[PDB]
Paper text:
In the complex structure, DGJ is located within a deep cavity, approximately at the centre of the proposed active-site cleft. The Kd for this interaction in solution was determined to be 485 ± 42 nM by ITC. DGJ is co-ordinated in this −1 subsite by a complex hydrogen-bonding network mediated by the side-chain groups of residues N67 (interacting with O3), K134 (O3 and O4), N135 (O4), N204 (O2), and N383 (O6). The side-chains of E205 and E349 occupy classical positions expected for the catalytic pair, comprising a proton donor-acceptor and nucleophile consistent with the retaining mechanism expected for all [name] members. Furthermore, the position of the catalytic proton donor-acceptor residue is consistent with an anti-protonation trajectory. A pocket positioned directly adjacent to the pseudoanomeric position of DGJ is proposed to be the +1 catalytic subsite that is responsible for binding side-chain xylosyl moieties present on XyG/XyGOs. Curiously, the apparent solvent-exposed nature of the non-reducing end of the ligand suggests the possibility to accommodate extended substrates, since the axial 4-OH position of the six-membered ring points directly out into the large cleft. However, in fucosylated XyGOs such as XXFG and XLFG, the pendant fucosyl residue is α(1→2)-linked to the galactosyl residue. Steric considerations therefore explain the requirement for CjAfc95A to first remove the terminal Fuc from such XyGOs before the underlying Gal can be addressed by CjBgl35A. As highlighted above, steric limitations of the CjBgl35A active-site also indicate that CjAfc95A must remove terminal fucosyl residues prior to fully enable degalactosylation by CjBgl35A.
Author numbering:
A (entry chain H), B (entry chain C): 37 to 575
Write the structure that this text describes.
């Protein structure tokens, strides 16, 4: 089988797996599930979820517990169990940084500051975050990572592991950069030529060329170089796609670097990361903002002609499930909810308060829409035109439920009109437009009021000028001409519900009558439709 | 087996099936269930309901997807599966009109307006409703319908299919008639002689003879002729009963034609339809009005010496179930709730908000009263005297629950009296009268307060001068002399609960004592009674 690879062309991207585009319908374990005994608490969630790919840590501490004495017993069990369950793997290399810190590095690393130095604050105090200028640290991380890749090269010939995450949420909390003498010497020196060339800047020292951004851009650059070197060394052994994941700053109201994780691939340093680390395939957002506007903004910032969108982590509470739709609609290669196992942990308030079948089912229900067409969607999402939307009002707050209750009948009617309008999305599909609305009956035209809780969305792919592939969830999708018809009329020509078998469309039934009079109405159950529109002459 | 046929005699009617009267205890699928793959979501509901007859579409688009290339693969599967389940079929020919529009006509029909022309408004705009004056449209519909009938002639010798509906809810929304030049020419001309003779009118042009009703009567007449020609051609192949179903106007407050579907068999044009389409066996109301008075009025309007009553569609929400009783009481030949399948659709607000076992059970419970005596009831309903009533107050409406709560103890007592009186119905059964009351204990005489929700009803057939067949549901039925007795007394002589086996009555037990002291009290469980009354001398 050909190696997995990330392709980028015409500003679009595909994760190739076994020689064709692939979508990661993912799940990630909790942080302490990377042991053989924990896997029995992982697989059942994955099965219930319908996930095709598991993201799970492989820790430097577990593979090199004593320097030079490697142990791949976990990776062995993991590969074998994944294959038995017919799922793929993304391994998360928890090493120099996990959430800014070295807790997953071996004891002989994290307890030897002299050999493996920490970031020093401007005031001289030390933080528990390893400096990217530590050359011994880099050499050691690199050597262990290379051994892991050698294990895969020798023992995973069919590429059960399809991607590797290098480190986990790199950066530093509590300072902007390393201010140690070692780091200060490099900061005071000239900005490297390659970076100056790539950003088309005037040469100089860090402070000269970057000014108020020098400290942060420096930390970002040095971390990016470190991760790039690890990535290169591993890829020289087996050239799997590799990526880094970002502890995000709020894109609207970030606060200061150091409050957020300074030096990671935050939106303001993506240009530094892309220049510094050309061997890292993509930079992936970790999404735990619950609210639609902020999530939408993150998706927009991380989807670029030079950056495939991969939602490497997202919260596992109910409101997050619907963000699958815009993720895929942006041409995303994957989506991976965090903490999908029964090892007695919840990261509430980030995720679900309780982990149970209902938690899982919120994601299972949206995965069921994509699984039946995964390869076909993946191809259209690289080579063609796709769209995806989610229900754009968050669930109504208690504060808003009180403001609603004390309103004035004229204010209530007006608020309902405003909500209806906000819950109506328009998409330009070329000759045809779609309108997506949320939370209304399947019959007649009473205006949308939203689902409770917010949960809906829709996917659309263009198959031809007048033909679209459509599936949606707790929503209505309606089609109309994109531009005025010169005395013509229009209608739905045909809607077929069906499936793909061996890449061929098989029709199950035609939607007509009630099922197409009031748009195309979807509940929680999966239906995949091919919709053919027609304008026709009446002259 | 003899062909099914609709008999009419002495102002009464019977649907003959296999040589004897038959009652359709029906169910109708949702509009997009007319495919082999959907049938697995249809049969279980039918079984749970206890229905004996399934109404399901056969679409022109599916049988003639390319002109001249016929495909009966769906009809084949459907016939075979129906027979395996030992049920009968009513096929619904979705063709030139389905709900006023051509969406179920093939693409080569509906997208070719030049060949198959649409209704043109008085202002020159075109509506998506095919004109009944289109001669190509008629020929093409007729040809396909004839092929369907040929399929049944050759492949359904035992008449699994017992009746065919020609079109579905014909007419036009948004205009009263076709105002195209083609139509305007026929409108300006003389009203056809046969119509002038049949309605005993003075000859003239449409506007002269009909005045303010000309536009609507013209559309009705032209549609009726079209449907009659299709019907005749099909019957020449196999002479099954055939009917049309009506998108009803509100009989008390109709609004204007075009707001309602103009040209269909609405109550104000039944005379036009009966004169124009003598080959169509009956005109069937589609009932979605929820309230007792309006439903009752519809049943009254559509039950005529020249029109067998068939409730071809009724809403599937709980309040509609009880209308089975007055339907059968009027000598109706059948009753068919709409949307009885699990294909992920509800026509709420017309039907039930959620489709589940409870939805089905509301109809199952009333069908269980009739199924055990279906052939016996059908014969009595043609040859004899039958009666049927439903609970005449709709379920109490929130607004009324508030008005009741803020009343004055004298106003509450008075309201309760008024309700009790409204919930008491009197029936003249010849020598004996019955009084039916709803929502009271099975013992003693506390006045009726109604069921919650409204749900009760009763069926009575006369077996002899003093003997009646009775079954009822969430109601009390009491008998008394119809005439003052000349110094005689009366009593129940005997009440037997039982069943029919090979057309013979088999007694299970005698109701007496508590069971007959306070009338005949019925809950949700089925009991079929023979009630013999007696007057006796005490002189
Ligand atoms: O549960 C919080 C979550 N935050 C993001 C990190 O990448 C994850 O490992 C985890 O710590
Ligand atoms: O669900 C509404 C119902 N209205 C009446 C039509 O005859 C049916 O086919 C269906 O459209
Ligand atoms: Na456009």
């Amino acid at each position: 089988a050909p190696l997995p690879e990330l392709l980028s062309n015409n500003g679009k991207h595909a994760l190739m797996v076994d020689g064709a585009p692939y979508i990661i319908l993912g799940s990630q374990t909790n942080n302490s599930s990377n042991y053989p005994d924990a896997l029995k608490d992982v697989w059942p969630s994955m099965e219930k979820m319908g996930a095709n790919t598991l993201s799970i840590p492989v820790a430097w501490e577990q593979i090199e517990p004593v320097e030079g004495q490697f142990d791949f017993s976990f990776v062995d069990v993991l590969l074998k169990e994944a294959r038995q369950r017919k799922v793929r793997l993304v391994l998360l290399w928890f090493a120099t940084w996990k959430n800014n810190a070295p807790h997953y590095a071996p004891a002989w690393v994290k307890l030897d500051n002299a050999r493996f130095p920490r970031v020093v604050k401007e005031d001289g105090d030390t933080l528990n975050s390893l400096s990217p200028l530590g050359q011994n640290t880099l050499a050691a991380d690199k050597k262990a990572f290379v051994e892991l890749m050698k294990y895969l090269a020798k023992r995973d010939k069919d590429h059960t592991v399809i991607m590797v995450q290098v480190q986990n949420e790199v950066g530093t909390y509590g300072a902007v950069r390393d201010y140690s003498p070692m780091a200060q010497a490099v900061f005071n020196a000239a900005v490297p030529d390659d970076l100056i060339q790539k950003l088309q800047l005037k040469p100089g020292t860090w402070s000269q060329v970057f000014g108020r951004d020098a400290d942060e851009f420096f930390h970002a650059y040095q971390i990016a170089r470190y991760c790039d070197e690890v990535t290169v060394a591993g890829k020289a052994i087996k050239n799997l796609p590799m990526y880094v994941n970002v502890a995000l700053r709020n894109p609207f109201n970030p606060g200061l670097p150091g409050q957020y994780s300074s030096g990671g691939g935050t939106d303001n340093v993506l240009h530094i990361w892309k220049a510094a680390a050309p061997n890292i395939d993509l930079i992936a957002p970790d999404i735990y903002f619950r609210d639609y506007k902020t999530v939408s903004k993150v998706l927009e910032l991380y989807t670029r002609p030079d950056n495939a969108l991969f939602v490497a982590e997202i919260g596992n509470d109910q409101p997050f499930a619907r963000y699958l739709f815009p993720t895929l609609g942006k041409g995303g290669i994957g989506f991976s909810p965090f903490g999908m196992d029964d090892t007695d942990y919840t990261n509430y308030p980030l995720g679900a308060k309780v982990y149970n079948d209902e938690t899982i089912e919120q994601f299972a229900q949206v995965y069921r829409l994509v699984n039946p067409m995964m390869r076909e969607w993946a191809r259209l999402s690289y080579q063609g035109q796709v769209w995806g939307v989610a229900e754009p009002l968050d669930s109504t707050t208690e504060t808003q439920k009180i403001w609603n209750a004390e309103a004035t009948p004229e204010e209530k009617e007006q608020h309902k009109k405003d909500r209806a309008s906000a819950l109506t999305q328009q998409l330009d599909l070329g000759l045809w437009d779609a309108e997506v609305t949320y939370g209304r009956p399947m019959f007649w035209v009473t205006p949308p009021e939203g689902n409770t809780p917010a949960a809906g969305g829709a996917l659309i792919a263009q198959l031809d000028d007048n033909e679209y592939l459509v599936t949606a969830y707790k929503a209505r999708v309606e089609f109309k001409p994109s531009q005025e018809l010169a005395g013509k009329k229009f209608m739905i020509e045909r809607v077929e519900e069906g499936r793909f078998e061996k890449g061929k469309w098989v029709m199950e039934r035609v939607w007509n009558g009630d099922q197409t009079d009031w748009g195309l109405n979807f509940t929680d159950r999966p239906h995949l439709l091919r919709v053919k529109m027609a304008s026709y002459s009446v002259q």
